[PDB]
Motif scaffolding. Structure first.
Motif, short mmCIF file in Angstrom:
data_model
loop_
_atom_site.label_atom_id
_atom_site.label_comp_id
_atom_site.label_asym_id
_atom_site.label_seq_id
_atom_site.Cartn_x
_atom_site.Cartn_y
_atom_site.Cartn_z
N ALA A 21 -20.06 -105.23 -63.84
CA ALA A 21 -18.58 -105.27 -63.82
C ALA A 21 -17.95 -105.13 -65.21
O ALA A 21 -16.92 -104.46 -65.40
CB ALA A 21 -18.12 -106.59 -63.21
N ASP A 22 -18.56 -105.79 -66.19
CA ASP A 22 -18.01 -105.91 -67.54
C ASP A 22 -18.51 -104.83 -68.53
O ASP A 22 -18.15 -104.91 -69.72
CB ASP A 22 -18.36 -107.32 -68.10
CG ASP A 22 -17.86 -108.48 -67.19
OD1 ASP A 22 -18.61 -109.45 -66.94
OD2 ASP A 22 -16.70 -108.41 -66.72
N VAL A 23 -19.33 -103.85 -68.09
CA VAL A 23 -19.92 -102.84 -69.01
C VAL A 23 -18.82 -101.93 -69.59
O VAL A 23 -17.91 -101.49 -68.86
CB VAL A 23 -21.00 -101.98 -68.33
CG1 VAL A 23 -21.31 -100.67 -69.10
CG2 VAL A 23 -22.29 -102.81 -68.15
N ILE A 24 -18.90 -101.69 -70.90
CA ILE A 24 -17.95 -100.86 -71.61
C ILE A 24 -18.69 -99.75 -72.34
O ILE A 24 -19.83 -99.90 -72.67
CB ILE A 24 -17.12 -101.68 -72.67
CG1 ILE A 24 -18.06 -102.27 -73.77
CG2 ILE A 24 -16.33 -102.80 -71.95
CD1 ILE A 24 -17.34 -102.81 -74.99
N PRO A 25 -18.01 -98.67 -72.67
CA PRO A 25 -18.66 -97.55 -73.32
C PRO A 25 -18.61 -97.65 -74.82
O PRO A 25 -17.87 -98.51 -75.39
CB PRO A 25 -17.77 -96.36 -72.89
CG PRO A 25 -16.40 -96.96 -72.82
CD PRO A 25 -16.62 -98.35 -72.32
N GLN A 26 -19.39 -96.80 -75.48
CA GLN A 26 -19.20 -96.46 -76.91
C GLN A 26 -18.29 -95.23 -77.03
O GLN A 26 -18.52 -94.22 -76.38
CB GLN A 26 -20.48 -96.10 -77.56
CG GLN A 26 -21.44 -97.23 -77.84
CD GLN A 26 -22.57 -96.75 -78.77
OE1 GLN A 26 -23.74 -97.08 -78.56
NE2 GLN A 26 -22.22 -95.95 -79.81
N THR A 27 -17.27 -95.29 -77.90
CA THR A 27 -16.24 -94.27 -77.93
C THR A 27 -16.07 -93.76 -79.36
O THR A 27 -16.14 -94.59 -80.34
CB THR A 27 -14.92 -94.89 -77.39
OG1 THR A 27 -15.02 -95.25 -75.98
CG2 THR A 27 -13.70 -94.02 -77.56
N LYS A 28 -15.86 -92.47 -79.50
CA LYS A 28 -15.47 -91.82 -80.78
C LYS A 28 -14.49 -90.70 -80.43
O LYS A 28 -14.87 -89.67 -79.88
CB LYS A 28 -16.65 -91.25 -81.56
CG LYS A 28 -16.25 -90.71 -82.97
CD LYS A 28 -17.46 -90.54 -83.90
N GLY A 29 -13.19 -90.88 -80.78
CA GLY A 29 -12.21 -89.87 -80.49
C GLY A 29 -12.09 -89.67 -78.98
O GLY A 29 -11.89 -90.62 -78.29
N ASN A 30 -12.24 -88.43 -78.53
CA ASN A 30 -12.06 -88.02 -77.12
C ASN A 30 -13.44 -88.03 -76.34
O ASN A 30 -13.48 -87.41 -75.25
CB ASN A 30 -11.37 -86.63 -77.03
CG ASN A 30 -12.17 -85.47 -77.65
OD1 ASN A 30 -13.12 -85.64 -78.45
ND2 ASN A 30 -11.75 -84.26 -77.32
#
Ligand code: NI
Length: 341
Positions: free
Chosen positions: A275-284
């Motif tokens: 439920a709580d999993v989030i991504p790694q993000t860079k820009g778009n």
């Protein structure tokens, strides 16, 4: 030289033993599934009988070029005689075409070799229900209580809901899914089905999927990347650099990537809910690691073994260190004292 845990005593048989040359006394080589650590050594020059599922035999003929006269496919859930010995192949709940093998030895001993498997309570109502098993050759990949992960159904729900939300917010987002072997096809098929798209991929990966007997597959996959908004890429390309480079190739059709890396277990499993999993993000660019496993969790393994009640266990994974071997043996003894066999 072939290790003892790949040999079936009282037979001419070996399991997943193709990288050792001609094994002395072997009359039939079984292959549990089409993963490289298990087929290592097979090629078009192999000249002994290979016993396997229909799907594994399609992959041996088309991908490795093994000649047809040496491929011996067996149906599942069916008593077969091989070189004078009764055998049964059972679904392993691993990747497509993966099997467990039941061997009924001439002296009355019964042996189960799990290959690679994800134990399930449905296996308690297969042909295993009917007789006693003396020896278990066990896929111990996750044999320690820290190895927890969700059901495959919870993980797929997370992936479908994540992808549908992102692309409905932004119709110009591309979804990318990593792959480096067969298995885990539900990840990319379920996402493409919610988006109303075919899955796009290389000619080499399309060829592999065409060997898998998946129903209606021609309706689900394509080599025309321009027509698809779910793309498959090699697992090595699932990083910010690889993904930027892919987005360049799409000719300004897209302005955002959402990417999935199906891993097995990672130590983010010991703290976080799906439920709580989030991504790694860079820009778009955003990358989700999702814990989609095709091997037993610790608890699923323990339930299967406590149900089966084998007289002897031979691990087939994590056998290279004394610490791993001692840890595994301690859990086996706990399980046996708790259940009373
Ligand atoms: Ni495997």
């Amino acid at each position: 030289t072939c290790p003892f845990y790949k040999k079936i005593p009282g037979t001419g048989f070996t399991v997943d033993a193709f990288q050792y040359g001609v094994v002395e006394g072997c009359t039939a080589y079984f292959l549990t599934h089409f993963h490289s650590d298990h087929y290592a050594g097979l090629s078009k020059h192999f000249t002994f009988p290979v016993y396997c599922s229909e799907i594994t035999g399609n992959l041996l003929k088309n991908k490795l070029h093994v000649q047809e006269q040496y491929i011996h496919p067996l149906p599942l859930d069916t008593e077969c005689i091989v070189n004078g010995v009764k055998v049964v192949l059972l679904d392993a709940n691993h990747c497509p075409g993966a099997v467990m093998i039941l061997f009924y030895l001439p002296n009355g001993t019964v042996i189960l070799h799990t290959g690679d498997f994800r134990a399930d309570p449905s296996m308690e109502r297969s042909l295993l229900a009917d007789q006693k098993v003396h020896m278990l050759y066990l896929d111990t990949t996750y044999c320690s209580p820290e190895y927890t992960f969700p059901s495959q159904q919870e993980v797929i729900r997370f992936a479908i809901n994540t992808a549908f939300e992102a692309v409905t917010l932004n119709p110009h987002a591309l979804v990318v899914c990593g792959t480096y072997s067969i298995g885990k096809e539900k990840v990319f098929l379920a996402i493409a089905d919610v988006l109303g798209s075919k899955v796009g991929m290389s000619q080499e990966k399309y060829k592999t999927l065409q060997c898998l007997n998946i129903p209606e597959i021609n309706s689900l996959i394509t080599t025309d990347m321009c027509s698809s908004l779910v793309h498959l890429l090699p697992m090595m390309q699932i990083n910010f650099k690889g993904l930027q480079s892919h987005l360049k190739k799409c000719g300004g059709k897209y302005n955002q990537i959402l990417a999935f890396r199906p891993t097995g277990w990672t130590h983010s499993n010991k703290f976080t809910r799906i439920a709580d999993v989030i991504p790694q993000t860079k820009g778009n660019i955003s990358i989700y690691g999702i814990p989609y496993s095709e091997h037993s969790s610790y608890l699923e393994m323990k339930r299967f073994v406590q149900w089966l009640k084998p007289q002897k266990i031979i691990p087939t994974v994590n056998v290279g260190t004394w610490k791993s071997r001692s840890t595994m043996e301690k859990y086996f003894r706990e399980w046996k004292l708790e259940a009373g066999y």
